Amino acid sequence: MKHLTTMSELSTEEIKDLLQTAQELKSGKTDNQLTGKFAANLFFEPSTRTRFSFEVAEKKLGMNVLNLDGTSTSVQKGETLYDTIRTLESIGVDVCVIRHSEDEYYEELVSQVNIPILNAGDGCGQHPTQSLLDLMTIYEEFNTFKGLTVSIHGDIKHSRVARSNAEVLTRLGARVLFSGPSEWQDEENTFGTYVSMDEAVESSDVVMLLRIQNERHQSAVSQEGYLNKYGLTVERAERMKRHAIIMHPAPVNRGVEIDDSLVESEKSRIFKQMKNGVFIRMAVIQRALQT
Amino acid sequence: MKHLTTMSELSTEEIKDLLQTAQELKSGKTDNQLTGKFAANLFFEPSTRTRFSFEVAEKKLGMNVLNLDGTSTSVQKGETLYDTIRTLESIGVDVCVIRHSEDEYYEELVSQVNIPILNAGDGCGQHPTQSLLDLMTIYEEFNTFKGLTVSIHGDIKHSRVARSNAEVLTRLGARVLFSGPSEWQDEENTFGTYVSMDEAVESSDVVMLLRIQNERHQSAVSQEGYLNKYGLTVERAERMKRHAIIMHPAPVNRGVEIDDSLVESEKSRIFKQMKNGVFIRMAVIQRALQT
Amino acid sequence: MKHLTTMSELSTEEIKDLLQTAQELKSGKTDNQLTGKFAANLFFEPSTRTRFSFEVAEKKLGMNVLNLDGTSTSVQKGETLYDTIRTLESIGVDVCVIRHSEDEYYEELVSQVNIPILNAGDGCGQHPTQSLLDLMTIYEEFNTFKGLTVSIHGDIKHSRVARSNAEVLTRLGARVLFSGPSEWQDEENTFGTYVSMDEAVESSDVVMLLRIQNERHQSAVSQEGYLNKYGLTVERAERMKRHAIIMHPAPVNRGVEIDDSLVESEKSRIFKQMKNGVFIRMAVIQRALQT
């Protein structure tokens, strides 16, 4: 069954097929194979990009959509996630998109249900459709992953994005760098080399920024000086390679991880990422429901 | 007009016709007679099965759907329910599905409004689509209601399900039994015979469990020892008749009214009920909008 | 791309064109020009009827619909409104309908974004589609605005819709009267003559009632004696001219601004206004997306 839980479960060939399908859908390719099928979006945590790009994708595929907010009344408390899924199966749901607070809620659940589950974030674990759309954006820019340097910046240890991305990029032939407060690094990582932002900006083909959370940083790391100290300043961006790009999964904390003036600057692909996410999610749903 | 408020307002022939229509829909029958019509789902109290079951039903009928989720301060400006419905009529709504907190909210309403109202639960009063889907499940199993013994267990006094069900089952020719804490029984119910669970499991063709609320009373009756004391234990289930079934309107409080292992055991029809609910609700909507 | 922010930004010719388009759509004129396009309803603040009316309009135009409300979106993060809209643009939204608490949220936003924004209500209280549907209702009745006497009743000082209506009615050639507690009157107002309700009912072609808020009432006027003292009583309504009409934006506080028996009386157009709202909103959306 074609669940999508983690990037680790996709081969580099599967990944490349998904990017190619997404690119074709972006170019206007459409079919009616999924018309009238039902998708349920179960979001137990807040989301703007992922939730609504999934909805657009479902509707562009001609699907009927059920939306469940799990932190609300439309999901019984204590009443198991397994039962919720089985309930949805019973009423005719063909695929479920889930964002849940628990790391790896998927493992056990996925083996016991009978419709494909698409992980919309089990942070701080995995965010596979976010990795796919980042890869798609990088692939559109350079037409290969081999020999690229991609640097990822911020709280690496707690990032589902940074985690989905570093290992898969290296599997695809890229060199990965990390930067940020040393205390937010996992200095047991095999997939990236820790450097300073000032070094990373000059050697990277892709400068990937993470959101510096206001609501979670239980640290000795001030947001007020973050940009100057660690973030992508205008001066640092000016030292980027000619053909390099800036990426950020959003929402962007303007003036913290990045200078406000750079979010929509020439080298930025931040909003292009969001465009691509819809087509990636269409491809992933098609993979889930194909026979 | 073809409202659906209470099982009492349906003749036994109307009930059998609805079940048959639903069975035909379940089998794959379909038409486009309601395509593009508008349904409004007004759930002023929480719901998972009923609400999403109706939404699937509506969408399978080709209808556009307006959802009003929660007593959220959408229409909370003191507007009468009558004005809310007349408002929906004015904007083009063809049918309203309503779950409300007030018992018999529908009585005054149904003679006053101009579009059909489908009751999705009115306090602890009635829940007619639940009864209908229950009946459909029972009929599929036995191909008759005559001479069946159906036992219903839990807080009979405060149950909209037990109320819809007990009376209609006797009208259809079945015998009804009740079990549960004596404090939760109708002092004077004329439709059922109070017995112990241990007796009921051996004499029933249908064992119907209700949800035991940890909401409200774990004080009137403790939940920790409920299963052993009153509930469908594995030992009790092993004493059920060979052809008997276990039913439950859900959500299930696993380990309280029923042993966790029984929810999807061989005699359980709990998830089949949920399958059937969609087709019952399609049939009810078609009856509402017929001609 | 045509935004809708305030009535004062529309020319009288633009207003007349919108009313004319809406009248044509009300008559059944339809086309497929917007089928499949995406509308996003961002109701950061609650509303019963405006959101539902927009959603019916969108769906009657064949559009796909995304519903947001700030709660379960990454909006509740630090994400700016601009970023939210740009995000929606990127995932393929063609038009946004926004009800938002910030004073003139639109003014900054509309110079910045690349898709049309339709103001469904801002911090200041500007509500152009309400004004448009009121005008449409009036125009259907009399086929002109020129020389009409329109009276508006209640807390004029704190109703920005009353004040925008007065201003636009005056631009359209009508004469505007106000009545209500003298302390709720706007002395500065140059678009209205203050009179008693007892006078206004006899000289008005249109009697426009405002909801009297049990709410607010910092300095309270009593609600219990309000109808007799200031409101549209049966005896007052019976002195209206034969062709005159009663209007109210809803929800109606029955027994306060108006006698309960008058809401659906012969001269009342209250529910007709709500019918008209759908077609006005279809027309405004077609204006927004016309090529």
Structural domains in chain C, CATH included, are: 1-126+269-291 (3.40.50.1370), 127-268 (3.40.50.1370)
Q: Which residues contact A77 (CB under 8 A, 6 or more apart)?
A: none
CB neighbourhood size of A194 (10 A): 15
Please state, in angstroms and rounded to a whole number, the distance separating the CA atoms of residues B231 and B290: 43
Q: What is the largest CA-CA distance in chain C?
A: 58
- Tell me the angle at which helices C105-112 and C81-90 cross, rounded to the nearest 10 degrees: 40
Phi-psi region of A36 (alpha: psi -120 to 50; beta: other; left: phi over 0): left
CA A197 – CA A180 distance, rounded (Å): 7
Task: Please state, in angstroms and rounded to a whole number, the distance separating the CA atoms of residues B51 and B70.
Answer: 11
Q: Are A98 and A128 in contact (CB under 8 A)?
A: no
Per the CB < 8 A criterion, the answer to whether B76 and B42 are in contact is no
Cα A264 off chain centre by: 20
For chain A, the C-alpha Rg in angstroms (whole number) is 19
> What ranges in C143-269 are assigned the alpha helix state H?
160-171, 197-203, 226-230, 234-237
Q: For residue C222, which amino acid is it?
A: S
What tokens appear for A150 in the block? 């991609």
Distance CA A14, CA A128 (A): 13
- Number of Cβ within 10 Å of residue B214's Cβ equals 13
Residue positions of A in the annotated binding site for L-aspartate?
Answer: 77, 160, 211
Q: Which tokens go with B201? A: 């499991």
Cβ pair A174, A202 in contact under 8 A: no
Q: How far apart are CA C282 and CA C126, in angstroms?
A: 19
Q: How far is A81 from chain B (nearest CA, A)?
A: 11
Distances (CA, A) of A215 to A60, A211, B194, C161, C206: 34, 11, 55, 39, 54
B1: three-class secondary structure by DSSP: coil
Q: How far apart are CA C268 and CA C245, in angstroms?
A: 6
C28-54: b (≥16 Cβ within 10 Å) or e: eeeeeebeebbbbbbbbbebbbbbbbb
Q: What angle do CA C231, C206, C186 make, to 5 degrees?
A: 60
Residue B101 has which token pair? 């907190």
Inter-chain CB proximity C91 and A275 less than 8 Å:
yes
d(CA C169, CA C7): 10
Q: Is C254 annotated as a binding residue?
A: no
Residues in chain B: 291
| Greatest C-alpha distance within chain A | 57
**Dihedral Cα A71, A75, A80, A86, nearest 10 deg:** -130
User: CA of A101 to nearest chain B CA: how many angstroms apart?
Assistant: 20
Q: Do B53 and A91 touch (CB under 8 A)?
A: yes
Q: Which residue has the tokens 């070094």?
A: A199
Both tokens of A55, joined, read 């909805």
User: What is the rounded distance in angstroms from the CA atom of residue A103 to the CA atom of residue A109?
Assistant: 12
Cα B108 → chain centroid: 22
| CA count, 13 A, side-chain hemisphere, B53 | 29
In angstroms, rounded to a whole number, what is the distance separating the alpha carbons of residues A233 and A260?
9
Q: DSSP secondary-structure letter at C222?
A: P
B152: helix, strand or coil = strand
Q: Is C116 one of the annotated binding-site residues?
A: no
**Is residue C244 within 8 Å of C205, Cβ to Cβ?**
yes
Nearest Cα of chain B lies from the Cα of C41 at a distance, in angstroms, of 13
Q: Which residue has the tokens 């690496």?
A: A156
Angle formed by the axes of helices B49-60 and B128-142, to 10°? 80
Please answer whether residues B211 and B249 qualify as being in contact, where contact means their C-beta atoms are separated by less than 8 angstroms.
Answer: yes
Instruction: Write a three-state SS string for chain A.
Output: CCCECCHHHCCHHHHHHHHHHHHHHHCCCCCCCCCCCEEEEEECCCCCHHHHHHHHHHHHCCCEEEEEECCCCCCCCCCCHHHHHHHHHHHCCCEEEEECCCCCCHHHHHHHCCCCEEECCCCCCCCHHHHHHHHHHHHHHHCCCCCCEEEEECCCCCCHHHHHHHHHHHHCCCEEEEECCHHHCCCCCCCCEECCHHHHHHHCCEEEECCCCCCCCCCCCCCCCHHHHCCECHHHHCCCCCCCEEECCCCCCECCCECHHHCCCCCECHHHHHHHHHHHHHHHHHHHHCC
Which one-letter DSSP state was computed for residue B179? E
Please provide residue B245's backbone torsions phi and psi, each rounded to the nearest 5 degrees.
Answer: -125, 155
Number of CB pairs, chain B paired with chain C, less than 8 A apart: 60
Smallest Cβ–Cβ distance between B78 and the set C56, C253, C278 belongs to C253
Cβ B60–A92 below 8 Å, yes or no? yes
What phi and psi, each to the nearest 5 degrees, are found at residue B86? -60, -35
CA distance B91 to chain C (A): 5
Residues 6+ positions from A203 with CB-CB distance below 8 Å: A149, A151, A177, A241
Phi, psi of C149 (to 5 degrees): -105, 120
What is chain B's alpha carbon radius of gyration, rounded to the nearest angstrom? 19
- What is the widest separation between alpha-carbon atoms in chain B? 57
Q: Which residues of B touch C278 (CB under 8 A)?
A: 91-92
- B261 secondary structure, DSSP code: G
Distance, in Å, from the CA atom of A70 to the CA atom of A47, rounded to the nearest integer, reads 12
d(CA A285, CA A263): 30
* In contact, C157 and C186? CB cutoff 8 Å: yes
Among the partner-chain residues B76, B79, B92, the one whose CB lies closest to the CB of C56 is: B92
Q: How many CB atoms lie within 10 A of CB B17?
A: 14
Give the separation between CA A120 and CA C211, rounded to whole angstroms.
Answer: 44
- For the stretch A197-208, what's the b/e string if a residue is b when 16 or more beta carbons lie within 10 angstroms of its beta carbon? beebbeebbbbb
A280: its two tokens: 């990636």
Q: How far is CA A265 from the centre of its chain?
A: 22
Provide the resolution (angstroms): 2.1
Backbone gaps in chain B, preceding residues (C–N over 2.5 A): none
Instruction: Find residue A179's DSSP bridge partners.
Output: A153
d(CA A214, CA C291): 43
Give the pair of three-digit tokens for residue B220: 């009137």
Number of residues in chain C = 291
The single residue listed with the structure tokens 């007990």 is B166
Task: Name all chains with 3 or more CB-CB pairs below 8 Å to chain B.
Answer: A, C
Question: For chain C, give me the number of helices (H) and strands (E)?
Answer: 10, 9
Distances (CA, A) of C146 to A3, C10, C138, C143, C149: 65, 18, 11, 9, 9
B5's tokens: 């408020």
Report the C-alpha gap between B84 and C132 in whole angstroms. 22
Whole-angstrom distance, CA of residue C53 vs CA of residue C44: 16
B36: its two tokens: 């593009």
